[PDB]
Amino acid sequence: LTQPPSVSVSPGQTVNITCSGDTLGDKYVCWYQQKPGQSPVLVIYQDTKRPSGIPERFSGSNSGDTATLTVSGTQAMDEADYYCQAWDSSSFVFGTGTKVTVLRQPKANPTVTLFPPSSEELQANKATLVCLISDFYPGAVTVAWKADGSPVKAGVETTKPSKQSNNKYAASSYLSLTPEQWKSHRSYSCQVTHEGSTVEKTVAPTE
């Protein structure tokens, strides 16, 4: 029971997730939608049927060796992994899942918020600079840190971007210093480049 690993679509445009296996038409197919960090949700059962609550935008078919989940006016919130599941009188088999992406979403610049070490963390003899990056699209940024204008090439941890609930992306970056290192420079800069343009935020030990 196989599915394409990924499929992409424009917003409002219809996408098809296929599931294929021998004599699949002789089996009852279910479809599950699983958004990131969430449980799977039954979206189609008995090839064609929607559970109460599932909108008409979702529909299913199953003929021959291929079953198809169709979603018509695809919105960004429809992005998920879709799994098919085929039933016999004796067994079931899960599909390997298909990730759906919506592509032509409007461009969005990142919001950057940068926090200095709390006095509490300093008294615990550590110093973390926290750079939080929000509301950008597409979901790719580059993060560079500077200390007094020179590149910081170590002690940085940056997450991969992940989807927010409003369908834009977020990421975060951490610069971990000793209190000594923190106080030994005049300025620190977190710089976030997105689509060729850059947003920089500064903190300084002298507040």
Partner 1 sequence: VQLQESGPGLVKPSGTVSLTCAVSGGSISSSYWWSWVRQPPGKGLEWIGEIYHSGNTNYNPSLKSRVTISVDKSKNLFSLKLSSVTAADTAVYYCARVALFDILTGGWFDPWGQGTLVTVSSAGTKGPSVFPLAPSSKSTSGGTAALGCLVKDYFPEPVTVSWNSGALTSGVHTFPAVLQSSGLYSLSSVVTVPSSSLGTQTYICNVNHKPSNTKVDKRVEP
Which contacts (CB < 8 Å, 24+ apart) does range 37-45 have? 40/83, 43/69, 43/82, 44/69
> What is the 8-class DSSP label of residue 156?
E
Q: Does 85 bind partner 1 (CB under 8 A)?
A: yes
Q: Which of 10, 49, 103, 186 binds partner 1 (CB under 8 A)?
A: 49
CA dihedral 11, 13, 14, 15 (to 10 degrees): -50
Minimum CB separation from partner 1 for residue 164, in Å?
Answer: 7
Minimal distance in Å, beta carbon 157 to partner 1? 4
Answer for which of 41, 76, 152, 199 binds partner 1 (CB under 8 A) is: 41
∠ CA(1), CA(11), CA(97), 5° rounding? 15
183 near partner 1, judged by CB under 8 A = no
CB of 136 to partner 1, least distance (A): 13
Torsion of CA 182, 155, 110, 184, to 10 degrees: 20
Binding mask 119-158 for partner 1 (x = CB under 8 A): -xx--x-x-x-x-x-x----------------------xx
